[PDB]
Design an enzyme around this catalytic site. Structure first.
Site, PDB file in Angstrom:
ATOM      1  N   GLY A  44       0.751  -1.229  -0.064  1.00 54.09           N
ATOM      2  CA  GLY A  44      -0.120  -0.069  -0.044  1.00 54.09           C
ATOM      3  C   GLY A  44       0.940   1.537   0.096  1.00 54.09           C
ATOM      4  N   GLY A  46       1.493   4.899   1.790  1.00 60.72           N
ATOM      5  CA  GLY A  46       1.420   5.264   3.155  1.00 60.72           C
ATOM      6  C   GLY A  46       2.599   4.788   4.076  1.00 60.72           C
ATOM      7  N   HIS A  47       3.409   4.029   3.470  1.00 54.01           N
ATOM      8  CA  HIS A  47       4.731   3.701   4.144  1.00 54.01           C
ATOM      9  C   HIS A  47       5.924   4.193   3.586  1.00 54.01           C
ATOM     10  CE1 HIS A  47       1.872   0.700   5.475  1.00 54.01           C
ATOM     11  NE2 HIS A  47       1.751   0.203   4.313  1.00 54.01           N
ATOM     12  N   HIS A 198      -0.420  -0.940   9.377  1.00 54.38           N
ATOM     13  CA  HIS A 198      -1.402  -0.221   8.761  1.00 54.38           C
ATOM     14  C   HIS A 198      -2.499  -0.086   9.785  1.00 54.38           C
ATOM     15  CE1 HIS A 198      -0.258  -3.695   5.783  1.00 54.38           C
ATOM     16  NE2 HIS A 198      -0.564  -2.681   5.109  1.00 54.38           N
TER      17      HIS A 198
HETATM   18  C1  LIG Z   1      -0.157  -2.756   3.314  1.00 48.88           C
HETATM   19  O1  LIG Z   1       0.051  -1.460   3.043  1.00 48.88           O
HETATM   20  C2  LIG Z   1       1.197  -3.275   3.190  1.00 48.88           C
HETATM   21  O2  LIG Z   1       1.269  -3.630   1.835  1.00 48.88           O
HETATM   22  C3  LIG Z   1      -1.452  -3.443   2.673  1.00 48.88           C
HETATM   23  O3  LIG Z   1      -1.554  -4.690   2.835  1.00 48.88           O
HETATM   24  P1  LIG Z   1      -2.801  -5.216   3.026  1.00 48.88           P
HETATM   25  O4  LIG Z   1      -3.630  -4.420   1.804  1.00 48.88           O
HETATM   26  O5  LIG Z   1      -3.699  -5.228   4.325  1.00 48.88           O
HETATM   27  O6  LIG Z   1      -2.838  -6.803   2.385  1.00 48.88           O
END
Ligand SMILES: *[C@@](O)(C=O)COP(=O)(O)O
Ligand SMILES: *[C@@](O)(C=O)COP(=O)(O)O
Lengths: 336, 336
Positions: A44, A46-47, A198
């Site tokens: 995702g 956000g990191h 998350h």
């Molecule tokens: C999180 O940003 C790590 O990539 C997203 O993971 P999920 O969409 O919960 O699998």
């Protein structure tokens, strides 16, 4: 679209990167680099800077950001892998979350069917909780950054796909992480102990007394939750099928040499991370752990969460040579 | 003591630095470096990585951190200068605040009186408020970082004290900055516009509508507040006296080539800084400004303040070569 604006900004800021559209993904401007294993990851948004800030020589060939806290769809992963394929195979680093495993595994199969030699490495370093909100097993967190750098160096030097995959799986068994939040991206003088990147709940909510005491709790947890046996599937490209492999982690122990990563989850002042590092060095010395190298800063974040994580990765001379090897990316840069 | 812990942590993390006690300051482990101008700065703690993260080859020879948001005392500055003195003079970069000016100026006289050839550069880049709470004139903020890098390159290559000082003063007249806060280190959906790095009030409090609109207001302010005439004293080491020098800044204008620094004041996610950069490039292109290089990240902070600043520094080919020259510090690293 704000995510569109952010990636446009990333691209404008770094001419060493190419932002693709339809579908969206990011690669090194010089990909495909012929004759070397290509390394890819994603997850995702956000990191930041994980994973786009790790694209460059000696690290990722490309990365596939998804929507906030959401895995990229399989089309993005497939197209990114095809774009970076240098004819020596593509290695996919996947953080252990339901969504990422599903989407990266689907892309892996699509790739194989298109004739691309591919395999995978799953990252499950978060020692806090087994079977979290969005994970089967242990969550993949900051050690992903350390593994990307180390496997990146091995790929850059010319190691084969198998060699890079094997190194990544071995490092995964030797790296251990834990994070805490003082505030979400909610209790006053209380922390979320063993929080996930998350926003997933931790081991518990407990009182924050001081930085040094929080580090002691985190460090103690790394020492006692180290032991772990579990199955991690990897793609066997010769048989064209998922291979269930039992994988074992030993606890960190006196005499181990480690790389330490003190990581800002988002809004912790850097001065505080140095305070953390000071206490961490003390505890490692007392426990017989030798910190050989370190990284301190914002490397695997969770938007603007106030908190931080500690990662300790066991290493040897060969792995330290891979650490010291050159890397040229937005977030990490050093020469010989 | 927490500051003691944080400074010990910085030192343990970076073998290239030496932490001194009685009094406290930090230098390059290899200082004094004979035959080169030595460069020093300092100020309150709470702005990390400024200035300790800028100690290293191609940048600061040392730095003098004070207590949180408080100038170091003159003994720290004096002893740090004596430790790094390489026989070719010490250049002190001073941010424009009442306390810093008083303390660095006092240290300058003590150094001179002790036989050390020294001179100064004052940084007053914040275009937002003239005569803030703790400043006569305009506040010294993030452009201090760009100047340390550029003058650091000049000193590193062997330029004379006079040449390094002249360069610093010229660059100070060509760099313009402005910061905003969405939260202090107080209003809800409002921002402090033109905020200072120790929490000083800005131009005003106004509604926050969007990221793009905020960047527009900040950018417009840099274009219209650029013109500035004022006196900045500098130490004339030949006469042994302060020299009152009129200094002039021209507004940024079409045709200017700039280095852009988008700086996290503490708790703004990197993703958002890329969105800021994306809008900034659009505005620069419309105004006829060419952005030749950029830095995006946490470089001059205010503890955990939520906000960011934008700095634009006018440059030419010679200044861009100084930017591209090698630097090896905790916060900035490149050999090209
Ligand atoms: C999180 O940003 C790590 O990539 C997203 O993971 P999920 O969409 O919960 O699998
Ligand atoms: C601030 O941290 C800049 O060094 C401290 O400035 P004053 O003590 O307000 O001069």
């Amino acid at each position: 679209d704000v995510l569109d604006e952010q990636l446009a900004g990333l691209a404008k800021a770094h001419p060493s990167l190419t932002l693709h559209q339809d579908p969206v993904y990011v690669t090194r401007a010089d990909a495909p680099v012929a004759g070397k294993v290509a390394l890819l990851s994603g997850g995702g948004s956000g990191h930041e800077p994980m994973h786009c800030g790790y694209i460059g020589q000696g690290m990722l060939s490309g990365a596939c950001p998804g929507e906030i806290f959401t895995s990229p769809t399989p089309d993005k992963i497939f197209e990114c892998a095809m774009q970076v394929d240098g004819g020596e195979g593509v290695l996919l680093i996947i953080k252990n979350y339901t969504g990422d495993i599903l989407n990266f595994e689907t892309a892996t199969e699509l790739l194989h069917d298109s004739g691309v030699k591919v395999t995978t490495v799953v990252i499950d370093d978060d020692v806090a909780v087994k079977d979290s909100l969005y994970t089967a097993g242990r969550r993949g967190v900051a050690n992903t950054v350390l593994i990307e750098k180390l496997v990146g160096a091995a790929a850059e030097r010319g190691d084969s796909l198998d060699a890079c995959a094997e190194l990544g799986r071995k490092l995964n068994n030797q790296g251990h992480s834990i994070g805490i939040a003082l505030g979400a991206c909610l209790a006053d003088n209380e922390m979320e102990f063993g929080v996930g990147i998350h926003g997933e709940p931790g081991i518990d909510r407990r009182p924050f007394s001081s930085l040094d005491q929080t580090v002691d709790e985190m460090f103690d947890t790394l020492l006692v939750n180290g032991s772990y046996h579990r199955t991690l599937r990897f793609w066997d490209y010769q048989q064209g099928s998922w291979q269930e492999e039992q994988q074992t982690k030993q606890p960190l122990q006196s005499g181990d040499r480690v790389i330490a990563l003190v990581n800002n989850l988002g809004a912790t002042p850097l001065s505080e991370l140095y305070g953390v590092y000071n206490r961490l060095t003390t505890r490692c010395q007392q426990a017989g752990l030798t910190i050989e190298r370190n990284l301190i800063g914002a490397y695997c974040t969770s938007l603007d969460m106030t908190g931080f994580s500690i990662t300790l990765l066991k290493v040897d001379d060969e792995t330290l040579a891979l650490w010291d090897a050159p890397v040229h990316t937005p977030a990490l840069n050093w020469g010989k």
